[PDB]
Design an enzyme around this catalytic site. Structure first.
Site, short mmCIF file in Angstrom:
data_model
loop_
_atom_site.label_atom_id
_atom_site.label_comp_id
_atom_site.label_asym_id
_atom_site.label_seq_id
_atom_site.Cartn_x
_atom_site.Cartn_y
_atom_site.Cartn_z
N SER A 45 2.79 -22.24 72.23
CA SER A 45 1.81 -21.90 73.22
C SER A 45 1.83 -20.44 73.68
O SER A 45 0.89 -20.01 74.36
CB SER A 45 1.85 -22.79 74.46
N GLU A 143 -1.60 -28.79 65.74
CA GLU A 143 -0.82 -28.56 64.51
C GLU A 143 0.02 -27.29 64.50
O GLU A 143 1.02 -27.26 63.80
CB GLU A 143 -1.71 -28.46 63.29
#
Length: 265
Positions: A45, A143
């Site tokens: 992230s 993914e």
């Protein structure tokens, strides 16, 4: 209170996994200390800051608007989308999407933002243009967190990420308004309490973004400093560990305590 590099190596031993770390002087960009600075780790992230950089750059060039409202649907929702799942009716603005992506690590907001720029390849192209040929985004959420050993997809090096973050926050790459917005978003991060923020004395400033992925992958990028002003960039990644999420958080928090306790050096 171990010295930072001693603590980082200790963290590798505790976690049974590679840890990469770098500390830059925010003003000069000088590397102050590092560990595995030129090895690759999954960004997870933490890419979302770079993504919002790309979006802000588009805004600066008149190709995008902070207030532009995007409507989306159930089909777009992926796991860990605490903001976007509440706005199926009303949609969200680009501004609100970057806020959700950075501050809440909203995975759907990040995908929506990827769409606005034309996909992960366009982020990678934006990066190349700014001089970063190491950092690469290849996939979408979820993914891109797969963290397959030695897969270079969706990876960076601590040194590349640190430098790129500095260029976004302080360089001429983004307008003064956009630079400030980006740091304001990262300051307002809500989901990284157990990481460097847990070590931070009152009065300090931190603007950060966390990531977690598979195969024990965990990491954080930050600009932080005493007296309400960031003065250094810290980037920490790890991947491979079988330790619990709490264990991995603790090691990162402990690296933070070291760098805090030795900051005046």
């Amino acid at each position: 209170h171990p010295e930072t590099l001693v603590k980082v190596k200790d963290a590798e031993d505790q976690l049974g996994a590679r840890v990469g770390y770098i500390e830059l002087d925010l003003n000069s960009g000088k590397i102050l200390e590092s560990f595995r600075p030129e090895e690759r780790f999954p960004m997870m992230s933490t890419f979302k800051v770079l993504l919002c950089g790309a979006v802000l750059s588009r805004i600066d060039a008149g190709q995008e608007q902070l207030g532009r409202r995007i409507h989306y649907s159930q089909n777009d929702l992926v796991e860990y989308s605490p903001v976007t799942e509440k706005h199926l009716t009303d949609g969200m603005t680009v501004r609100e999407l970057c806020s959700a992506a950075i501050t809440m690590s909203d995975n759907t907001a990040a995908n929506l933002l990827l769409t606005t720029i034309g996909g992960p390849k366009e982020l990678t192209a934006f990066l190349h243009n700014m001089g970063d040929h190491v950092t690469r985004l290849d996939r979408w959420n979820p993914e891109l967190n797969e963290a397959i050993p030695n897969d270079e997809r969706d990876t960076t090096m601590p040194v590349a990420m640190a430098t790129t973050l500095r260029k976004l926050l302080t360089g001429e790459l983004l307008t003064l308004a956009s630079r400030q917005q980006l740091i304001d978003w990262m300051e307002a991060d809500k989901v990284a309490g157990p990481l460097l923020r847990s070590a931070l004395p009152a009065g300090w400033f931190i603007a950060d973004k966390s990531g977690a992925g598979e195969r024990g992958s965990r990491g954080i990028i930050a600009a932080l400093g005493p007296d309400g002003k960031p003065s250094r960039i810290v980037v920490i990644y790890t991947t491979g560990s079988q330790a619990t999420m709490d264990e991995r958080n603790r090691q990162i928090a402990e690296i933070g305590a070291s760098l805090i306790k030795h900051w005046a050096a």
